[PDB]
């Protein structure tokens, strides 16, 4: 029933998922940080690496914590 | 790896996908001396250097062809009658060689 | 009896009849939906 | 409304029209050319196919 | 001209096939091959045109395909209710428009 | 809506000629590619001539070349295959043909003679 196939503190990793017009996106960006108390100040802009706009209607997800 | 593969599956065990991410060409199935028959009906015979699709085949298999006049759309015979039913809603093109 | 094997024998023999002559067939079926497409073929590319 | 006059009871066969041409035609020109339309690949020396 | 098994015999049962063999310029473009049904006592209304497609008069017993250098057909049982001569009409392009074949007569016992 | 009538059984002589008509009238002739296929007694069918019913596009058989003339009457929707210079070996049974393929398409499909003309023989005996 599969629909696609593609092969590609200290750390801060950001992910974003958006749903327009019938493909499958992946956003990914990793950056090193040196801070433990709060959010560091600075602007990092996430760039989709596997940019193919989703469009699937999903209103529910789950987080995967460390 | 898709067209020069080793061993076939069952006839009913195929991939419910269409090819993806490719320079679709139509050229090899016409010009290669291994191929003899290729009849596209609803699609133009040279129309893949602009056409384009969504999911992805990995149909990597080869099988004995001693059932030529029964492996074709809209046919009856010893193969596509039981254990694999040809659909009413088939849409595509057939190679024979 | 009357409850047989799932498979029934043809002949893997090159000496069989004219209907049992080897011509291989692989079917490539086309489907295009409202979901956009990816097998786009580049037009022939000339030099810059 | 004229079904009755330019219509033979056994069939009116004398009215022609062009269904095949390599190019779309121009406003108010007259084309009398009768060259055989090229559809496939190989040409004819006055034969069919 | 085009070779094929010319005379047969049959009773009802299980499928039997026919061919009609041409050359590469004949079999390459002659995919318009079809078989003139000349039944005894009627006009040669062929009941098969363009292989697998038909006019009215026959069931779906007959199959249409091309077999390398041979223009081929497959009956579900050449049998005793189908007395009819056939031919094969291949569009030969560079040659004559269409040259016929050996003339397989589908016949009875 | 197909009507097809040929001539009757005849008898002729060698060196003569027959101006045979092959007559139909009463449907759209322009949509069909009219062929001309004959047969023989106990032998197969062989094709001779072809007809595009508009402006009389002409093509001849190689076997009967130089002795064939093709003409038509589009005014009365009639086509001729004039069998000229009748011979001694002319003893056979010949037919016309007709197409029923809808030739407003570009492809050179096979003519659908889902009706074939009646009966004719140009027999030449002493």
CSV table of N, CA, C and O in Angstrom, one decimal, chain C residues 17-41:
chain,number,residue,atom,x,y,z
C,17,UNK,N,3.8,-27.5,-28.9
C,17,UNK,CA,3.0,-27.0,-30.0
C,17,UNK,C,3.2,-25.6,-30.4
C,17,UNK,O,4.0,-24.9,-29.7
C,18,UNK,N,2.6,-25.1,-31.5
C,18,UNK,CA,2.7,-23.8,-32.0
C,18,UNK,C,2.2,-22.7,-31.0
C,18,UNK,O,2.6,-21.6,-31.0
C,19,UNK,N,1.2,-23.1,-30.2
C,19,UNK,CA,0.7,-22.2,-29.1
C,19,UNK,C,1.7,-22.1,-28.0
C,19,UNK,O,1.5,-21.1,-27.2
C,20,UNK,N,2.6,-23.0,-27.8
C,20,UNK,CA,3.6,-23.0,-26.7
C,20,UNK,C,4.9,-22.5,-27.1
C,20,UNK,O,6.0,-23.1,-26.7
C,21,UNK,N,5.0,-21.5,-27.9
C,21,UNK,CA,6.1,-20.8,-28.4
C,21,UNK,C,6.5,-19.6,-27.5
C,21,UNK,O,5.6,-18.9,-27.0
C,22,UNK,N,7.8,-19.4,-27.3
C,22,UNK,CA,8.2,-18.4,-26.3
C,22,UNK,C,8.2,-17.0,-26.8
C,22,UNK,O,9.1,-16.6,-27.5
C,23,UNK,N,7.2,-16.2,-26.3
C,23,UNK,CA,7.3,-14.7,-26.5
C,23,UNK,C,6.9,-14.0,-25.2
C,23,UNK,O,5.7,-14.1,-24.8
C,24,UNK,N,7.9,-13.3,-24.6
C,24,UNK,CA,7.7,-12.8,-23.3
C,24,UNK,C,6.9,-11.5,-23.3
C,24,UNK,O,7.0,-10.7,-24.3
C,25,UNK,N,6.1,-11.3,-22.3
C,25,UNK,CA,5.2,-10.1,-22.2
C,25,UNK,C,5.4,-9.5,-20.8
C,25,UNK,O,5.2,-10.2,-19.8
C,26,UNK,N,5.7,-8.2,-20.7
C,26,UNK,CA,5.6,-7.4,-19.5
C,26,UNK,C,4.8,-6.2,-19.7
C,26,UNK,O,5.0,-5.5,-20.7
C,27,UNK,N,3.8,-6.0,-18.9
C,27,UNK,CA,2.8,-4.9,-19.1
C,27,UNK,C,3.2,-3.7,-18.2
C,27,UNK,O,3.5,-3.8,-17.0
C,28,UNK,N,3.2,-2.5,-18.8
C,28,UNK,CA,3.4,-1.3,-18.1
C,28,UNK,C,2.2,-0.5,-18.2
C,28,UNK,O,1.8,0.0,-19.3
C,29,UNK,N,1.5,-0.3,-17.1
C,29,UNK,CA,0.2,0.4,-17.1
C,29,UNK,C,0.4,1.8,-16.6
C,29,UNK,O,1.2,2.1,-15.7
C,30,UNK,N,-0.4,2.7,-17.2
C,30,UNK,CA,-0.3,4.2,-16.9
C,30,UNK,C,-1.5,4.6,-16.1
C,30,UNK,O,-2.6,4.3,-16.4
C,31,UNK,N,-1.2,5.4,-15.0
C,31,UNK,CA,-2.2,6.0,-14.2
C,31,UNK,C,-1.8,7.4,-13.9
C,31,UNK,O,-0.7,7.6,-13.4
C,32,UNK,N,-2.7,8.4,-14.1
C,32,UNK,CA,-2.4,9.8,-13.7
C,32,UNK,C,-3.6,10.3,-13.0
C,32,UNK,O,-4.8,10.3,-13.6
C,33,UNK,N,-3.4,10.8,-11.8
C,33,UNK,CA,-4.5,11.3,-11.0
C,33,UNK,C,-4.4,12.8,-10.8
C,33,UNK,O,-3.5,13.5,-11.5
C,34,UNK,N,-5.3,13.4,-10.0
C,34,UNK,CA,-5.1,14.9,-9.7
C,34,UNK,C,-3.8,15.2,-8.9
C,34,UNK,O,-3.4,16.3,-8.9
C,35,UNK,N,-3.3,14.2,-8.3
C,35,UNK,CA,-1.9,14.3,-7.7
C,35,UNK,C,-0.9,14.5,-8.8
C,35,UNK,O,-0.9,13.8,-9.8
C,36,UNK,N,0.0,15.5,-8.6
C,36,UNK,CA,0.9,15.9,-9.7
C,36,UNK,C,2.0,14.8,-9.9
C,36,UNK,O,2.1,13.8,-9.1
C,37,UNK,N,2.7,14.9,-10.9
C,37,UNK,CA,3.5,13.8,-11.5
C,37,UNK,C,5.0,14.1,-11.4
C,37,UNK,O,5.4,15.2,-11.3
C,38,UNK,N,5.8,13.0,-11.5
C,38,UNK,CA,7.3,13.1,-11.3
C,38,UNK,C,8.1,12.5,-12.4
C,38,UNK,O,9.3,12.8,-12.4
C,39,UNK,N,7.6,11.7,-13.3
C,39,UNK,CA,8.5,11.0,-14.3
C,39,UNK,C,8.6,12.0,-15.5
C,39,UNK,O,8.5,11.6,-16.7
C,40,UNK,N,8.9,13.3,-15.2
C,40,UNK,CA,8.9,14.2,-16.3
C,40,UNK,C,10.2,14.1,-17.1
C,40,UNK,O,11.3,14.0,-16.5
C,41,UNK,N,10.1,14.0,-18.4
C,41,UNK,CA,11.3,13.8,-19.3
C,41,UNK,C,11.8,15.1,-19.8
C,41,UNK,O,11.1,15.8,-20.4
